[PDB]
Structure formats: structure tokens, C-alpha cells
Amino acid sequence: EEDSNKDLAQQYLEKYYNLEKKDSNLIVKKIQGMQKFLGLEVTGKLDTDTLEVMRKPRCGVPDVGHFFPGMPKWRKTHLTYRIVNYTPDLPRDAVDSAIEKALKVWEEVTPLTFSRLYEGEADIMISFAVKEHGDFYSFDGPGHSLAHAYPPGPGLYGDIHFDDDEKWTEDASGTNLFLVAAHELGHSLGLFHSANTEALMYPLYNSFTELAQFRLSQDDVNGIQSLYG
Ligand SMILES: [Ca+2]
Numbered sequence: 001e002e003d004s005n006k007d008l009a010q011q012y013l014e015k016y017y018n019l020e021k022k023d024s025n026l027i028v029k030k031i032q033g034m035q036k037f038l039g040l041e042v043t044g045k046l047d048t049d050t051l052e053v054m055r056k057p058r059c060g061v062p063d064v065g066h067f068f069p070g071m072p073k074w075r076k077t078h079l080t081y082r083i084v085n086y087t088p089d090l091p092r093d094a095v096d097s098a099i100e101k102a103l104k105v106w107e108e109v110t111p112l113t114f115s116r117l118y119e120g121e122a123d124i125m126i127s128f129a130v131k132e133h134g135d136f137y138s139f140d141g142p143g144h145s146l147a148h149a150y151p152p153g154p155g156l157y158g159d160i161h162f163d164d165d166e167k168w169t170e171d172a173s174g175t176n177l178f179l180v181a182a183h184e185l186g187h188s189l190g191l192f193h194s195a196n197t198e199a200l201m202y203p204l205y206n207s208f209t210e211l212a213q214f215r216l217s218q219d220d221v222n223g224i225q226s227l228y229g
């Protein structure tokens with residue numbers, strides 16, 4: 001309803017547009033910034049389109065900020081990854097297959113190569129978790145934030161976490177693990193969110209896409225090749 005729409009917008013803006021840290025116009029300017037970035041008509045109002053976007057599942061990484069113990073790109077060309085645990089939603093090989101295909105998306109357009117490790121420290125540590133799980137971004141239950149990932153660097157940098165309160169699927173018939181994994185790997189390699197609704201790195205989950213027809217946008221390719229040549 002209406003007051004909840006108010007509460008949803010505030011929580012959305014604080015989460016992804018650094019709203020916090022007495023001028024009703026302060027919230028208005030953040031609305032406008034979110035509308036511009038996500039491709040909505042810039043009304044500064046909490047209109048029906050804006051609230052629908054705010055209700056949609058999406059990546060947990062914010063949309064503002066690009067900024068560091070970390071780095072803008074990996075300096076090595078040979079990167080390692082590890083699937084630390086698995087969702088019960090899918091068979092082991094389906095999770096493995098989804099991550100391998102998402103890795104191949106980026107291998108095809110960069111000089112980067114990826115090796116799998118089953119034990120110990122890998123650059124890209126990949127796991128599934130619910131609610132609080134030992135970093136700064138607790139997951140939020142079904143829907144909303146689906147996953148997040150961190151830019152290049154040591155330790156928790158480059159890692160990928162999937163919210164296991166989503167129902168992860170192998171087809172476009174649900175929350176597709178491959179598609180989310182491919183987006184989150186973008187973060188792991190140094191990319192930020194795109195304002196191109198067609199781009200993989202756009203922040204909202206794209207549930208109207210035939211997997212056979214999936215392809216990186218020219219914006220995604222230009223972005224990753226600006227980093228890795
Ligand atoms: Ca098998």
C-alpha cells in the first residue's frame with residue numbers, strides 16, 4: 001500500500017543509492033538519481049513504474065560509488081576459483097555447469113583464464129548463504145537482493161555470494177544461476193553496474209531472456225576490454 005511504498009523506497013535508496021549519512025528535497029534528488037540510472041522517466045516521484053522497479057529482484061551491489069586494499073583489475077592473467085558450497089536447489093553438476101558457462105562468457109572476450117580449486121584459497125571464492133554470513137551485507141530472504149560480489153583484490157575481494165533464499169534454476173524458468181553468476185563475475189573482474197537495460201551488468205535480474213539467445217551487450221564488452229585489452 002501507500003505508506004509501505006514510502007518505506008520500500010527509503011530502504012531501497014539507502015541500500016543502493018547511499019541515501020543515509022530537514023529537506024524533503026533530499027529524498028527527491030535520490031529518487032531522480034535512481035530513475036536516471038535505471039532508465040525510468042525522471043519525475044522525482046514514487047510513481048507506479050519506479051515502485052515496480054524497486055520491487056523487482058536484483059543484484060545486491062549498490063548502484064552508486066566506484067571508488068582501497070583492492071584493485072581496479074587483476075594483475076595476473078591466470079585466475080583461480082572455488083565452489084565452496086552448493087545450493088540444495090540443484091544437482092551438483094548443474095551448479096558446476098552453470099559456473100563454468102558463466103566463466104566462459106568472460107573468457108571469450110578477455111585474455112583471462114580460470115582454473116578450479118577444490119580446497120584452500122582460490123581468487124574467486126563462490127558460495128551460497130542466507131541472512132547474515134560473515135561479511136558486511138546480510139542477505140534479505142526471498143526476492144530483492146539475489147547475490148553480490150566484490151571487485152579484484154586479495155581475500156574477500158573477488159568473491160561471489162548467492163542468496164540461498166532464492167530458488168535457483170537451470171533454465172529461464174526461475175532465478176537462473178548461470179545468468180546471475182555471469183553478472184556477479186563481472187564485479188569480480190572489476191566492472192560496475194550499467195545503465196543499459198540490455199547489458200548483463202544492468203542491476204535488475206532479466207527474467208524475460210531465452211538462454212539460447214543470451215549474449216553480452218556491446219557495453220559489457222567495451223567495459224571489460226577497457227580493463228583487460
Ligand atoms: Ca556428473
Ligand SMILES: [Ca+2]
Nearest residue numbers: 123155157158
Ligand atoms: Ca577472493
Ligand SMILES: [Ca+2]
Nearest residue numbers: 141143145163
Ligand atoms: Ca534475497
Ligand SMILES: [Ca+2]
Nearest residue numbers: 164165166167
Ligand atoms: Ca534456495
Ligand SMILES: [Zn+2]
Nearest residue numbers: 048049052053
Ligand atoms: Zn512491468
Ligand SMILES: [Zn+2]
Nearest residue numbers: 059060061203
Ligand atoms: Zn551487480
Ligand SMILES: [Zn+2]
Nearest residue numbers: 121122155156
Ligand atoms: Zn582467505
Ligand SMILES: [Zn+2]
Nearest residue numbers: 133135137161
Ligand atoms: Zn556476502
